[PDB]
Structure formats: C-alpha cells, structure tokens
Amino acid sequence: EIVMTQSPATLSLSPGERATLSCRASQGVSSSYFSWYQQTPGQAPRLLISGASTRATGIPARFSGSGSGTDFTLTISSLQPEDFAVYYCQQDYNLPYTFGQGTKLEIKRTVAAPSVFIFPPSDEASVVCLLNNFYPREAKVQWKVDNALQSGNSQESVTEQDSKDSTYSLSSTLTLSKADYEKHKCEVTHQGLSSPVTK
C-alpha cells in the first residue's frame, strides 16, 4: 500500500501570497495517477489537479501542480478567500487507492491576545473558561484546583477562523461533580499574553 504523506499539517499564509504544498509518496507513483483535492469544511471534496499537473474543469488558472516519482507539489498563484481550506493528495496507481492526511490553509493575521472570561457554574453544570478573538489558535487552557495542575478534565471546543478578523474562540469547560467542586477552594498560555491569566 502506497502511503501519501503531506507536509505541513497546517499552513498559515496571507491573502495574495503563493502556497506550495508537498505530498510525499512511500513508493514510486506514475504522475498520470496522482491527484489533488480541495475540501471546504462542510462541503464535499473537489478535484483540482489531475495527472499531477492537468487542471480540472472549472478550476481557476491560479492552481498549478507538478512533481514526479515520490515528490509532488501543489502551487496556488495568489491565495484568494476561497483558497483557504483543506487540500488532499491521492494515488489511484496501486490498490488500495490511498489519500493523504490533508493540509489546512489558515489566514495569517497578527498575534491577538485572548480575552479570557471566567464563568462559574449555573443553576436550574460546570465552569467555562472562554477565550475570545485570539490568534494564533495555539492556546493552552490549564485548569487549577487549589494551586495544582489538572489533566483530562476539560472538554474544549474551537470555532472556525473568523471570516473577517481571522481569529478563533475556545470554550474550555472544566467538567466536575457537584460534590467534588464544593470540596476545593484556568491558566491561559497564549502567545499574545505574557503571563498565565487566572480568575
């Protein structure tokens, strides 16, 4: 089974720049049976480049492909708003036909520090530590219980990148029991901030 490996996993670029995506095949593949696919989150994949270089019907001229043997490359001339999605490579050259792990294109902006907002449990629940409009996505929400680190106790959820400000939002919900919570008396580590915030 020919394994396809893409590099990197995520690529942060700005609208108007070039984008060079790589796909390494574990075995030699005929360029006539290598393809590129774009998939926008929520939709279905779409063929961009067939035959390692041939442009599919309807694909804009800013998409160009090349490569041979075990090294193939997808090039985007100018990154446009739609051209910020997940891109896959595949081979239909040897059974079973395999795909790559994918590569997400992220809008590059500026290191915006998060706005942490602590929310105690409700009543009618857990504690929610919301970070709002932070870039990059790389944020560390470490929870504290009486000055002690916590691991495997928080359910997190990240939204998509804002289609206007290129920012993210995270809802780290530290799940706990109503009895154990009343027996004890977050710490954000984002690049924007310089000190783990806590409240």
Place this chain on the structure above:
Amino acid sequence: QRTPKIQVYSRHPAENGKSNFLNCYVSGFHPSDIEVDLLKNGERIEKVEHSDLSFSKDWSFYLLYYTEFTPTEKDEYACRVNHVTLSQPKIVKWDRDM
C-alpha cells in the same frame, strides 16, 4: 522450469588458422538466471561477451555468448551452461559441421 537449448557454432565457415567467432546460443530456458562459459580444451575462456536478455513468444529467454577464436587442428572447443533445471552442468562440444 524449462531446460535451455544449446547450439555451439562458428559465425564464419570453419578454417584452420583463420580467426573466427565461437558462438554459444542458449535459448528456451526459464528463469533468466543462467551461467554460460566457453571452453577451449577444458580451459575457461575469460574474454567472453554475451548479448542482451530477451525472450520469445513462449516467454522463454535466450542469450548469445561469443568470443573471437582461431580454430586449429586438434583443438576442442565447448560450451558449459548451468541452470536451476540442471543438477549437473551441461557441456556441448563444437562440431565444424553443426
């Protein structure tokens, strides 16, 4: 696993004193792993060239081993071929009318 067929012959008509080419045409064997040596009175001739590896319609390979030699009176030449289909290597002597 088909055994090879051996033909030992000279390119030009045999004539004592005149230089010629001793050929050993091995054909009809499978697999392609084969060993061929041209012999002069039992001595293994070292300056031996062979053709490129090709096969027939029945997928059996064939090769042409050759070297330049000068036939003389009382000088026996032969071809020693070895193959997986042979427990003992086969020797085919050269006849000037063959």
Place this chain on the structure above:
Amino acid sequence: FLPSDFFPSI
C-alpha cells in the same frame, strides 16, 4: 519510442 507512463500497477 517508448509510450507514455499511462500504465498503472497490477
């Protein structure tokens, strides 16, 4: 003149 690399694997 060899053909193109349109033959896939077996």
Place this chain on the structure above:
Amino acid sequence: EVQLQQSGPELVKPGASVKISCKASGYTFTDHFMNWVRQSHGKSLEWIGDINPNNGGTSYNQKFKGKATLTVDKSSSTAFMEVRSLTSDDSAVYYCARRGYYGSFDYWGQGTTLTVSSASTKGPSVFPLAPALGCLVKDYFPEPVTVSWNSGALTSGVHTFPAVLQSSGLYSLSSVVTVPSSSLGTICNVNHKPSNTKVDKRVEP
C-alpha cells in the same frame, strides 16, 4: 452537468445494516466507474471500493472486505453501497466519487452522514450564564441544535461553538455573544427537531 445525488443522513443502532444510494445524471453512466469513499470526523479520506456499472464487477479495499458491498442499477443509473454489521466506528460521512475516464475522482456527491449509536433521542438542558452572556446546551441527541440570540437581532460576536460528544454519548454546545461594558441595562433561541422544544431564556446576574 454531472450531478451525483446521494441519500439522506441515517441514525442506526449497532449491529444493523444501512444502504446508501447514489443517483448519477448528466453523463453516460456506463462510461465511468463509480467509487465510494468514507471520511470520519476530523479524519482524512479512505477509498472503500469501486464498481463497474456495465457488469457489476467490483473491487474492494482489504479493510472493507465484509463491511461494505457495492451494487449498481443501469436502469435508474444508481449506485448502491450496503454497510453491514454497523458499529460506532462506522459512523462517518460517505461519498460516491465518479472515476475519470483515464483516472482520478472527477466528480463527488454531496455526501451521506451515517451515525451508529444506541441512543434514540434526548432533550437539551439550557444553563444560562451571566457575570458576555451565555446559553449552554447540555445532553442532547442527535445533531443538530440551532442556537440564535434575540431572534437574530444580535449577531455581532455570536460565537456558537461546535458540539462536542460527551462520554455519555450525548452532545453539548454553547452559544456565546459579547455585549459592551455599557450594557448593564440592554433571548436564547435553541431549537432541536426531535426534542420538539425551543428553550428560550434570559441571562441576568
């Protein structure tokens, strides 16, 4: 125009079998092989198998030998895939991708979401928060839940986080909208089709 119309989503119990249909139009159905691809949540694509629409000949990925079966019907130009002995690991999105005449997957269907779970239908539990406000939905099933604010009159800063599957097998999302500091004196619109409940509440400290 080549159009691949697939079937709708399906929520089934473990050990059952489902059958997805793929309607082809806009081209000669017998001129192209039809493939099937599965994509799990947060995962990449995996080729399941293909089928020759002329004689029904099939080839399968070794992993799906005994899990999925491909059939076609040249009359209605429809390709079928039956997935048997369904487990929680079979829950994913399934596509039918047409094979190009000389290679590649030139056209894809819209997809068919499959969910394999023992649960039937749960009901949301709105827990409001107020120190930005919050409308935390908890322990619902299945997807999805539409969470609006002020009936749409407050969409600036509406960060509705995607649902997360809990250890109990239920989902939970949280809709949060930001309000200014001069907003001490300034309603959630959760909706769930199987729950038949539209829990509208308020947020006040």
Place this chain on the structure above:
Amino acid sequence: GSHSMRYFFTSVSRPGRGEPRFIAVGYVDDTQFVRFDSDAASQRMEPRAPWIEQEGPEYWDGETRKVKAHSQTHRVDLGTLRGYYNQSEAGSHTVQRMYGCDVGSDWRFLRGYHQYAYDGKDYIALKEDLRSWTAADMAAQTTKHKWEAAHVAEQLRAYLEGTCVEWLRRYLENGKETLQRTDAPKTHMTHHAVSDHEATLRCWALSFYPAEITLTWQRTELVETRPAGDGTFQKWAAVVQRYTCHVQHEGLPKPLTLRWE
C-alpha cells in the same frame, strides 16, 4: 514489405538486494536497436544499432526517463503480485511484458499486441481488437478490472496506432540502408555417412536477413534460426533424390533448389 517495432521487458526480483533486475530491449523487425540494464553504469538508454545514433540528446533523454518509469511500475507489480498470490518475501520472481505494432506494405497500421507474464506463465494480454483484456486467473481478473477503470486499453490503443507506427516509419527511414536491404542466404551443401546404408545431407543457409526462412525436403531435422553475431542469421536442415533442398527467402527473387554434386 511489412515491418514491426517490438519492446521486451524483464524485471527479476531479488530478495534482500533492493531494486529488481530490470532489462529492456527494443526491436525493429529482427534488429535490436536499444537496450537498458538497471545494473549498468550509464543508467540511461543505450543504442544498439548504427542508424538509431542519428537522434539527438533530446531523444535519448526522454527514452531514458520512460524506460525508468517502466521499471518503477514493474517494481510495484512484483510487490503486488506477491500479495495477490500470497508468496514468500524471500523468494525470487519474474515479470515479463511485451508489446508492439506492425505495419503493412503501405506502412499503415496493421495489428498491435501487448502481453504480460509472471514466473513464465501467461497473466494478462490485450486482445487483437485492442479494446479488451484476456485474464488468466482471478488475480489477473482483478488487474483487468483495475485497467478497465482508467481505460488503459484506450490509451494503449492510441499509442500503437499513432505514436508507435509514426516512429516505426522514422526508424525505417533513418535505417534505410540496413532495415530495408534484404540479405540473400549464401548456400552450400554438406554430405556425411551415418549408417551402413543411409547417409545424411545437410543444407546450409547462412548470413541472411530477415530471420524468416523455410527449408524443407518435400515431394527430416532442422534447428532454430540462430544469430551469426553480425546482424545476419543462420539455419540448416538435414535429412537421412525424390526431394531436394528447397530454400525460400525474401531476399531471393526465385527459390533456390540445390542437390549434392
């Protein structure tokens, strides 16, 4: 007359020695003009005829890349065929592929062919109609399904009827003074005694081109047409006066009849 261009490929896998031994030869009629060996030092396609050396470096560059792609496919084929039949990873195996195109007296396309073998047995072959594959067993039926998916027979059909024939005409033209010049067989007879009452007359045919020739004693024992080593061919037929040596060759306007004297 009629002509043909044929290509022969052989890839022998060697367990524990990395890349399989890939050897390729090309033919125009009974004349080899190109060769390739994965164990050679040049690592590129090499001429084997004088007339083919009239092609610039752009020809030899593309032919070198195309023959290396053929080895890359046969390398994956050996690995896949090992899994199709579930064979040991420490055993050696052989894949052979051959294809080519023929032209008639008008130098237009006449027939094409393509065959593939594994361990000396027929695996898959293209039918004469150039649109369907003949599969030997279930493993080959999987391959036939794989090739019918990407319409490989349609792409190979376009090569045999177009590119293969056009370059065959160019090879015949550039090799005019050798490929289109027949060589008549130089004939001589030999006499030997093998029994107390019966003898053996051997009719020799030497230094002729093309290789096809018919020797019969019609109103016996004959060997295979062997190469002389200089581009010509040899053959003889023996028998132990109602039948004479009837030699028939394209280089002879009238057949040759010889008797012992």
